[PDB]
């Protein structure tokens, strides 16, 4: 289930135009983030209690606001 949650999350910030490529995954990103966070808190308490990593925090917190402000996330990457 953690694996499925990550695969449901990834298109949102990897799409070059999420509003026209993955609206169904976009509209439930908040619910997926909540579910992922509660899973990490409960089932994986042995690693994520009082210590979490930068990229997990970023993915679970800041993505929708960045999408709203910019329009796309993957377009402005450093992969180019």
Partner 1 sequence: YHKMYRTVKAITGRQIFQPLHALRNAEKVLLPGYHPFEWQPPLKNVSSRTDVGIIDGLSGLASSVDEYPVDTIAKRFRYDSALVSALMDMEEDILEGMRSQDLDDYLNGPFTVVVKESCDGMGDVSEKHGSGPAVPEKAVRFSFTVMRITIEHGSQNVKVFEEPKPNSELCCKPLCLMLADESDHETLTAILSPLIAEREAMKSSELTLEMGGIPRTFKFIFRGTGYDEKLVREVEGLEASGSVYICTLCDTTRLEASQNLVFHSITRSHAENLQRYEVWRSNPYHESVEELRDRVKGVSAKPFIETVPSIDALHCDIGN
**Which residues would be at the binding site for partner 1 (CB under 8 A)?**
6, 10, 13-14, 16, 33-34, 37, 40-41, 48-63, 65-66, 69-70, 73-80
Residue 1, H or E segment? none
Q: Which of 1, 4, 20, 54 binds DNA (CB under 7 A)?
A: 54
4: tokens are 């499925």
Question: Which three-class secondary structure state does DSSP give residue 59?
Answer: helix
Minimum distance of DNA from residue 70's CB (angstroms): 18
Mark the segment that binds DNA (CB under 7 A) among 3-11, 35-43, 47-55, 63-71. 47-55
Give how far Cα 22 sits from Cα of 52, 66, 72, Å: 28, 16, 11
């Amino acid at each position: 289930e953690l694996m499925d949650l990550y695969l449901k999350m990834k298109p949102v910030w990897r799409s070059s135009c999420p509003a026209k490529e993955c609206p169904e995954s976009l509209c439930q990103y908040s619910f997926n983030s909540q579910r992922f966070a509660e899973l990490l808190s409960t089932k994986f308490k042995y690693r994520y209690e009082g210590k979490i990593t930068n990229y997990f925090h970023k993915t679970l917190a800041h993505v929708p606001e960045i999408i709203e402000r910019d329009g796309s996330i993957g377009a402005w990457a450093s992969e180019g």
